[PDB]
Amino acid sequence: GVIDTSAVESAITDGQGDMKAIGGYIVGALVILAVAGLIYSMLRKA
């Protein structure tokens, strides 16, 4: 079809500092909580 920077520019604009990003942080904390989870599993290792 028709693809070019326009979509990028429009797409970019269609997200003026919205709550769509606060999400990525939601993910960041996720990776941390899980990674640690594997660690505790080890302390239980007997």
Side-chain angles (χ1 to χ4, degrees), residues 16-32:
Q16 61 216 100
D18 195 19
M19 83 317 151
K20 176 55 158 62
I22 73 101
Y25 293 79
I26 271 272
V27 162
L30 218 80
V31 169
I32 303 175

Side-chain angles (χ1 to χ4, degrees), residues 27-42:
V27 162
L30 218 80
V31 169
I32 303 175
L33 291 174
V35 161
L38 277 291
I39 309 179
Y40 208 91
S41 326
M42 185 152 59

Side-chain angles (χ1 to χ4, degrees), residues 3-26:
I3 61 104
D4 190 65
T5 309
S6 182
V8 192
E9 165 270 308
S10 69
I12 282 164
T13 52
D14 293 355
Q16 61 216 100
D18 195 19
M19 83 317 151
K20 176 55 158 62
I22 73 101
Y25 293 79
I26 271 272

